[PDB]
Design an enzyme around this catalytic site. Sequence first.
Site, short mmCIF file in Angstrom:
data_model
loop_
_atom_site.label_atom_id
_atom_site.label_comp_id
_atom_site.label_asym_id
_atom_site.label_seq_id
_atom_site.Cartn_x
_atom_site.Cartn_y
_atom_site.Cartn_z
N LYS A 178 49.61 76.77 40.76
CA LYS A 178 48.36 75.84 41.42
C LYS A 178 47.35 76.96 41.28
CE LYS A 178 47.14 73.08 45.17
NZ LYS A 178 47.33 72.67 46.56
N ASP A 193 52.57 65.95 47.59
CA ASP A 193 51.46 66.96 48.01
C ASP A 193 51.90 68.39 46.91
OD1 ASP A 193 50.08 69.24 48.99
OD2 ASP A 193 50.96 69.31 50.90
N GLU A 247 43.00 67.02 49.00
CA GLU A 247 44.06 67.29 50.05
C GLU A 247 43.14 66.91 51.33
OE1 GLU A 247 45.01 71.33 49.22
OE2 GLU A 247 46.21 70.69 47.31
N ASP A 297 42.52 73.52 57.13
CA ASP A 297 43.73 73.79 56.37
C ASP A 297 44.18 75.17 56.23
OD1 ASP A 297 45.69 73.98 54.60
OD2 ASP A 297 45.25 72.26 53.38
#
Lengths: 381, 112
Positions: free
Chosen positions: A71, A10, A175, A199
């Site tokens: 990211k 991840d 994800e 999330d």
Amino acid sequence: MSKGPAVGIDLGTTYSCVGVFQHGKVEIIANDQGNRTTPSYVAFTDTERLIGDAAKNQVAMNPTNTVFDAKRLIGRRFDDAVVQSDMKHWPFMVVNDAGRPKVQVEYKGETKSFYPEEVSSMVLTKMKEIAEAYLGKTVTNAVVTVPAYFNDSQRQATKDAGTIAGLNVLRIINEPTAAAIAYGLDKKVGAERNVLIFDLGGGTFDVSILTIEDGIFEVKSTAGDTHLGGEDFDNRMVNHFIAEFKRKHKKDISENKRAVRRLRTACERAKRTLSSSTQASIEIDSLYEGIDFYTSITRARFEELNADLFRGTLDPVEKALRDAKLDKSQIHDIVLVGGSTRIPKIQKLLQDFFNGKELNKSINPDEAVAYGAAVQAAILS
Amino acid sequence: GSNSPQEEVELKKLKHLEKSVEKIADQLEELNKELTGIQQGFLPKDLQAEALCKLDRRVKATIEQFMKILEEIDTLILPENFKDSRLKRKGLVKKVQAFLAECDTVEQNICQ
Ligand SMILES: O=c1[nH]cnc2c1oc1ccccc12
């Protein structure tokens, strides 16, 4: 070393996580420092390059040369509204190289620039090494996770990071798809299932809706807040305490960076305690001007200070339901991901919204995406 | 007396932090010895500034280690009845703060 199995990685914004499916169960892999998650941080000093825990630990000493948040840059053009807005809050330099962003730091006395995928490849190399150290075998194959809203460029740039790191990227998976796989929502018998993934962790807030029919996944909608996370809940706590120290001692600690840090760190720890307890105690000796700060916060006080932020988590859920052309009654499964979903009020708010429907929360929220990716890696190997 | 076995656990945690503070204080002492060395040494005035500034990473690392010690001390909850632990914790915090003030002195006299 002999050949090893395939792993689930991840690749997070602030922390990364690696898992391996073996002996009929997923094993999250702890790093050398014994942590199940590793900071997505890369530091450049006068003598060496640091990754993970070692890079994060020296961030106060070398702020301009400690890169994180790659990211947020990966697969994006320099002139992207997101790149431009995020740039203001980073201690490190972001430069334009023919329309592409590059992080600019000082490495071993010289000025060097790195593409976001090169920085992410350093983090993936570390995750590959974390897995090799535990397994005692060479790790090459892996499944790497990306957010559902990632575009063609953002997904390719992530696959490139994997390639640069010497990884054979079995698949790039969403994800929220990874979190659904972790709970075996694709193995349940029946009609197509509508799944909502909540999330909240790693400095971002993501709400995704997925449809699963015969093990096939479809993203129906994505919503959220780019910069909402646990740090926002900590700031409210810190502000409350600063206000409290002013009321009690008629002194302002806010311009003393070391007092504020000591208080902030105590708040982050107190927040975690309030997820399992109704009260958290804090004892800080000689916090400011010799004054000892012995205090306490109830779960109800923490919830009140954060009432708007917590309530605001449902707006993205409503927006995602609208876009997916679904009513809240049409959602079969709800999945909790990210450390901030451990907050009991967030859980109460979300369950009350779905009229008392139980939530999938048994897998660690921080490790749920890496868990699914590890399962997928085992399926594809 | 009223000394409890439970407090022995807390005093042992404090004794380890005291040893850790001693290790960092030795780094601060070596930096001090080094800083004087450049100042009272064979380097020309120009070369001294550059050499003293090279100690910046080390002073900053010393400050950071002390801060981490403080953050670890701040995780202790010592009941009112643990008088000896409360005294050791307070004395240690004051010790670290005085070393931190010495570090600031070093930091203010280098890289200027
Ligand atoms: O990120 C977090 N937010 C709130 N509570 C917790 C978080 O991580 C934890 C780890 C252990 C226990 C509570 C928490």
